[PDB]
Amino acid sequence: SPLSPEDIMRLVQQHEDVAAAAESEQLVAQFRDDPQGLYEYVNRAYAEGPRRVTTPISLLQEEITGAVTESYPAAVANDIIGMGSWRLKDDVDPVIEFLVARLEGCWREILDTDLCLYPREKWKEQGWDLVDSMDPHQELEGFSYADIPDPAKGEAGYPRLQLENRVYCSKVFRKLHVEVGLRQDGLQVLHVVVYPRYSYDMPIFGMDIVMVDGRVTLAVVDCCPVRADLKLQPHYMETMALLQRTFLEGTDPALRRIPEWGSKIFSPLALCITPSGPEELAAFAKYAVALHRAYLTMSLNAVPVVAGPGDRREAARLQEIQDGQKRFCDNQLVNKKTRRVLEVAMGVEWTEAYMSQLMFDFDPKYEPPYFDASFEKLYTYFDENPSFGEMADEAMELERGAEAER
Amino acid sequence: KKSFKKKYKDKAIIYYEVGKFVLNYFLNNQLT
């Protein structure tokens, strides 16, 4: 009947395990019922129509002259914008256009209260926001994509290489990075990666598309685990499984080979594909968009792990997080494909610096700041449920009491 | 049909005033 000096610890373990399980289940409860809503949100938002704005100023306006003010949800707005103001559009294959538009739309729509731009001295003053091989010193001030015509075969320059990057910081993510590259021989790459801050226990999100002459030759998407055992939390595995059952069903199960280099960083549910026709590509695209959106929405409610004086478990957790992110960075650096397509065009002393400082940098002693602008939500609120000051109350009781005589 | 025409019109109308106010703010409160 009495208890033992050990089974107390058994009780502690069981309690914290049931707590973790409960919260992980609560996280998936939202996607579980209807997974299709992770890709079909734009179509539904379009279906519901343009909302009418009811704020005192707009009501007074549309009553005075005629002018009705209309609004649109965030999904429709980021669908109207599209590949908004990228300077290298008009050169991008429509598939890469679609994917970039969707990914940046989810960033701007979900993280909008804390999304900042990465510090400008780290990438944007070195001239890394738009890179051209025919002008490696920026003596045309970044208009080389328009001033210099494409070199013909055999001339000094063939083939030309162009890159464009965008880097953001946020509250949970220390870096959200999207980069597009074009080469004259008919090659186009797209590379997206999302790193959580050094104090959050989340996997790293990653996507790569490589298409040649309009045909997608390689496509890989995965949530690379960050722990030492290559094991995600329960809810990440559950969501990936549910989404693969939803979108990828009826497609190739044997084409999902695992690259030799990913075998040390990939999760057991990574997706690598050389698509066959249009249906495979459509399935993969829907799946990638849905997976990204689910990942961001589950990040919306993350809490850091803090190291308390005396606690060793949290120190161990922090060290494991740091080492997992570093392992990902150093094992991505030897993906020799992009490395060589860079270095055979821009040199090597440039390539090493660029790949070290921007693509896969890892310095735990520096993570960029952010700017929390949540107070904005107050202002918007109080412009549609306003309050009028103590003298409109008399006028309104007069209006009611005199109108109610009918 | 009308969907895409409305998309083009609205994009143009919005980007106009966005750029107008961005330059106003920059010149008045940041060049200084």
Partner: peptide, 10 residues
């Protein structure tokens, strides 16, 4: 009045 974009629903 036309699309010109690629979307996975044709």
């Amino acid at each position: 009045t036309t699309g010109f974009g690629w979307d996975p629903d044709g």
